[PDB]
Write a protein that binds this DNA or RNA. Structure first.
Ligand SMILES: [Mg+2]
Ligand SMILES: [Mg+2]
Ligand SMILES: [Mg+2]
Ligand SMILES: [Mg+2]
Ligand SMILES: [Mg+2]
Ligand SMILES: [Mg+2]
Ligand SMILES: [Mg+2]
Ligand SMILES: [Mg+2]
Ligand SMILES: [Mg+2]
Ligand SMILES: [Mg+2]
Ligand SMILES: [Mg+2]
Ligand SMILES: [Mg+2]
Ligand SMILES: [Mg+2]
Ligand SMILES: [Mg+2]
Ligand SMILES: [Mg+2]
Ligand SMILES: [Mg+2]
Ligand SMILES: [Mg+2]
Ligand SMILES: [Mg+2]
Ligand SMILES: [Mg+2]
Ligand SMILES: [Mg+2]
Ligand SMILES: [Mg+2]
Ligand SMILES: [Mg+2]
Ligand SMILES: [Mg+2]
Ligand SMILES: [Mg+2]
Ligand SMILES: [Mg+2]
Ligand SMILES: [Mg+2]
Ligand SMILES: [Mg+2]
Ligand SMILES: [Mg+2]
Ligand SMILES: [Mg+2]
Ligand SMILES: [Mg+2]
Ligand SMILES: [Mg+2]
Ligand SMILES: [Mg+2]
Ligand SMILES: [Mg+2]
Ligand SMILES: [Mg+2]
Ligand SMILES: [Mg+2]
Ligand SMILES: [Mg+2]
Ligand SMILES: [Mg+2]
Ligand SMILES: [Mg+2]
Ligand SMILES: [Mg+2]
Ligand SMILES: [Mg+2]
Ligand SMILES: [Mg+2]
Ligand SMILES: [Mg+2]
Ligand SMILES: [Mg+2]
Ligand SMILES: [Mg+2]
Ligand SMILES: [Mg+2]
Ligand SMILES: [Mg+2]
Ligand SMILES: [Mg+2]
Ligand SMILES: [Zn+2]
Lengths: 24, 78, 60, 155, 98, 127, 117
RNA sequence: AACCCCCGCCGUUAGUUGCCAGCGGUUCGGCCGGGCACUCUAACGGGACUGCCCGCGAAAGCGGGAGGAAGGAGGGGACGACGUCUGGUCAGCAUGGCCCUUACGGCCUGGGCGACACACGUGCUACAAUGCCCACUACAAAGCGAUGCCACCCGGCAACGGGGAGCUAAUCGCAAAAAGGUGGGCCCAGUUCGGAUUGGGGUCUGCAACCCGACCCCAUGAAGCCGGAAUCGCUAGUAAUCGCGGAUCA
């Protein structure tokens, strides 16, 4: 959920991009 | 977690390095608890401060990467 | 600890992060806007005096 | 709600059958404003509706809703002292809201995994009579007729 | 070639002065595109109305910063010297590119 | 020849261009049945046509943008209504009674202070 | 099959299988598959016997785990325990090791509520 | 009440926003020629007043209908009387009286405000199939940024580091908006639900992350199968749900 520190929904809520999401 | 330069206040080594010469004592009051335990720091006695007094905490090769503050409790009920 | 404390925030004779915000009129520390350099309180007094140009009681 | 009778909120007719009742039933399925699923899910059931029975989903739905239309219910009252459960009439507007609610509520009560099949089976059983949603109707209707005694204070 | 930007708080004066330039520059020189009202920059500021424990009913106001635009296409010296002594602002922010 | 009508709803706005032809209609590229795939209310904006029978007699190049997806369909629902009523005065007689010509004032309410969602008050207590 | 030499994930997709292995997670689950050329979707039950050994040999050697892993994690704490550091003393009183809340919550390291008042 | 503001319909002023809508060209991106139509942009206006028809009525006014983008306060905001609570704050500031004055004032280093056998309030994340995961694809508003937001390429699993273009900003950036669409897998399991906890490795800020930051990766995966007595919010674009911004600030 918006709590899993290791996924899409997690990084969306947490305010970070991280590995489990696009970047540069 | 800091990596470029394993910080540790100079006045720590400035005071202990001269000890590394003639292999002198170890008695010395300190305050830089935020400093790391120097790799070459083994076998010494830096009395760390905790807001009340200096803890005569002895060092060993097991306690190295950690900060010198860890081995000086601040909360009085350990 | 109010005057020698607003003086402390002025000299900046030491490290970077140690300097911090402060109100111009009073000396507050929290709720101090950078734009005006003022605390939320006086800012509301002045804004009712019009001593803050362009500012007006917003509503929508 | 003390002033006016408050106008009943009219809803937009179905973009697939044109009846306002269908969409109303859709809304109960809906959740968190995700009205996208409810419509789809409802029609998903309709797909299974014909697969099982030769009947069209439009009539089977109207048959199901009718069989779960409670003619009478019980409402609590204060006789200036004690508190009975007076049996009495039931507004037309209500009979629908309930016949839809219980339908949806009881729909999720089924064991099936996929939601649509639960509403499809429910709608069949409701139109039939053996529906669980129908029980919540048959059951409530009793409560009323049991207390037929306290009907004097019908107000 | 030449361009002018007029940021300002009091849109009342910034509207009339945006007119003044269009009055002179046009009626004494090249073509000048009419005043273009740009999207306004706005800084609101909500703040606890009271001086203490009352985190609500807090008052808030704004600080608009209106923008208006005007362009003189041909730098005719007839308009250049007039638009250099005829003006008279009070709180407008005039700028000029090329 | 042509027709036109604007449609606003929820920051969303739409220009409706009509041109006699098949059932061809596409808003800002992409086939219409592609810019609203999976969405059930898709055929809503097209409803204004079924009133005038001209469902299979007109084409449409539409320009809609701003706001969210669903609100757009309603902007076209009115955009087209303004269209075929434009280059056809007496068509109004049976287009307002059916209800298609209205801006729909419904818009999102501003969040209030001391609240959570302009109306949802915080959890009350006493303990 | 008994892959971890002790653990025995079976009858379900292989990619999720090795997950149930202690010391193996979702990450190494996807890696081990590719690092031995194996279909992730296939079930553990119906699978090539040769592949069984292949997946086993890899993981059982690539990275330590299980009882020795547990004793490793426990050793890293045993040292803290004896070292006399603040980090260890939080394992001592059983309190959290992140300096986090203690006036409330922290139930996970404190166990159920002791109440009394 | 009304005079002010935002949001609804429309007109005038305005053409670096916008559109082959119109023709031409095109490296087929509104990039170029070009125009103010439209959209948008922020200024001034227009419009709605029970004015019109009907029934009641002394009137005020109410009920229904037509026309209208909008009918009796169209929706939202700003604004809160004489006063009451010996309400709140002398710690924002001001101030009468009172007290200290090598000190009840000043400087720093380290500590604490982060303490935990508990209790209450407010809240976040979930117990899942109207769901979770992975890939692809579409639609916002309002905002903030020149020792600041950083396109684009290179290294890295990643947070980040280096090179480096654009930008006193409707011209450049923060910027994928998520839910949703399509596809695919999971098949009712304390599970691909759930991420608390913790071991190890690591990036950034900043003199400095033991006390005491945040973020990334691997591994470890807890309680929790809808919650006792009790109790809260909301009447319409509202509740519910989904995501984005800013102030504060290294
Ligand atoms: Mg970079
Ligand atoms: Mg760590
Ligand atoms: Mg290290
Ligand atoms: Mg020196
Ligand atoms: Mg002083
Ligand atoms: Mg600071
Ligand atoms: Mg909302
Ligand atoms: Mg608590
Ligand atoms: Mg006109
Ligand atoms: Mg052409
Ligand atoms: Mg033409
Ligand atoms: Mg070409
Ligand atoms: Mg062009
Ligand atoms: Mg050309
Ligand atoms: Mg004007
Ligand atoms: Mg009126
Ligand atoms: Mg009248
Ligand atoms: Mg009258
Ligand atoms: Mg008459
Ligand atoms: Mg009279
Ligand atoms: Mg009369
Ligand atoms: Mg009369
Ligand atoms: Mg009336
Ligand atoms: Mg209002
Ligand atoms: Mg008033
Ligand atoms: Mg205690
Ligand atoms: Mg209590
Ligand atoms: Mg994806
Ligand atoms: Mg992609
Ligand atoms: Mg977009
Ligand atoms: Mg700004
Ligand atoms: Mg700066
Ligand atoms: Mg390069
Ligand atoms: Mg790196
Ligand atoms: Mg790469
Ligand atoms: Mg860099
Ligand atoms: Mg380079
Ligand atoms: Mg340069
Ligand atoms: Mg710019
Ligand atoms: Mg730019
Ligand atoms: Mg951008
Ligand atoms: Mg289970
Ligand atoms: Mg299973
Ligand atoms: Mg230092
Ligand atoms: Mg559970
Ligand atoms: Mg309570
Ligand atoms: Mg209400
Ligand atoms: Zn002040």
């Amino acid at each position: 959920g918006k709590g899993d520190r290791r996924t899409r929904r997690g990084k969306i809520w947490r305010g970070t991009y991280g590995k489990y999401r696009p970047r540069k | 977690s800091l990596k470029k330069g394993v910080f540790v206040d100079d006045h720590l080594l400035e005071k202990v390095l001269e000890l590394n010469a003639k292999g002198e004592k170890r008695l010395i009051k300190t305050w830089s608890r935020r400093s790391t335990i120097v790799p070459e720091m083994v076998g010494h006695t830096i009395a760390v401060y905790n807001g009340k007094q200096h803890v005569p905490v002895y060092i060993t090769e097991n306690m190295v990467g950690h900060k010198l503050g860890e081995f000086a409790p601040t909360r009085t009920y350990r | 600890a109010r005057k020698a404390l607003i003086e402390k925030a002025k000299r900046t004779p030491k490290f970077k992060v140690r300097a911090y915000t402060r109100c111009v009129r009073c000396g507050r520390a929290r709720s101090v806007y950078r734009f005006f350099g003022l605390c939320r309180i006086c800012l509301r007094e002045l804004a009712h005096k019009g001593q803050l140009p362009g500012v007006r009681k917003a509503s929508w | 709600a003390r002033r006016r009778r408050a106008e009943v909120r009219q809803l937009q007719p179905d973009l697939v059958y044109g009846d306002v009742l269908v969409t109303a039933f859709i809304n109960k399925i809906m959740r968190d404003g995700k009205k996208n699923l409810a419509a789809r899910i409802f029609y998903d059931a309709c797909k299974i509706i014909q697969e099982k029975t030769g009947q069209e989903p439009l009539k089977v739905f109207k048959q199901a809703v009718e069989n779960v239309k409670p003619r009478m219910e019980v409402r609590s009252r204060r006789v200036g002292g004690a508190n009975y459960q007076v049996p009495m009439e039931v507004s037309p507007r209500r009979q629908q809201s309930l016949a839809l609610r219980w339908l949806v509520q009881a729909a999720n009560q089924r064991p099936e995994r996929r939601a649509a099949v639960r509403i499809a089976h429910e709608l069949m059983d409701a139109a039939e009579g053996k529906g669980g949603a129908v029980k919540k109707k048959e059951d409530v209707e009793r409560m009323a007729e049991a207390n037929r005694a306290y009907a004097h204070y019908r107000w | 070639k030449i361009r002018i930007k007029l940021r300002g708080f009091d849109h009342k004066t910034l509207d009339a002065s945006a007119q003044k330039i269009v009055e002179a520059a046009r009626r004494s020189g090249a073509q000048v595109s009419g005043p273009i009202p740009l999207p306004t920059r706005v800084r609101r500021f909500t703040v606890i109305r009271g001086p203490f424990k009352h985190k609500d009913s807090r008052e808030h106001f704004e600080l608009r910063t209106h923008n208006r635009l005007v362009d003189i296409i041909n730098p005719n010296r007839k308009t250049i010297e007039q638009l250099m002594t005829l003006d008279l602002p009070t709180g407008v922010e005039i700028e000029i590119k090329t | 020849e042509q027709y036109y009508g604007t449609g606003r709803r929820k920051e969303a706005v739409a220009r409706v261009f009509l041109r006699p032809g098949n059932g061809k209609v596409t808003v800002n590229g992409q086939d219409f049945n592609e810019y609203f795939q999976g969405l059930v209310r898709a055929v809503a904006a097209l409803e204004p046509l079924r009133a005038v029978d001209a469902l299979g007699r007109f084409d449409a190049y539409i320009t809609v943008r701003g706001g969210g997806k669903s609100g757009q369909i309603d902007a076209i629902k009115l955009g087209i209504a303004r269209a075929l009523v434009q280059y056809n005065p007496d068509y109004r007689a049976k287009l307002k009674p059916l209800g298609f010509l209205t801006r729909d004032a419904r818009v999102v309410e501003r969040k209030k202070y001391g609240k959570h969602k302009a109306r949802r008050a915080p959890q009350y207590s006493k303990r | 099959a008994r892959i971890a030499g002790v653990e025995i994930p079976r009858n379900k997709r292989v990619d999720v299988a090795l997950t149930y292995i202690y010391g193996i997670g979702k990450a190494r689950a996807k890696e081990a598959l590719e690092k031995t050329g194996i279909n992730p979707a296939t079930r553990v039950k119906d699978l090539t016997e040769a592949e069984v050994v292949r997946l086993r040999e890899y993981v059982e050697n690539t990275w330590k785990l299980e009882g020795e892993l547990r004793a490793e994690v426990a050793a890293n704490i045993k040292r803290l325990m004896d070292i006399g550091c603040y980090r260890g003393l939080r394992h001592r009183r059983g309190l959290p090791v992140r300096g986090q809340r203690t006036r409330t919550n922290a139930r996970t390291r404190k166990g159920p509520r002791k109440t009394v008042a």
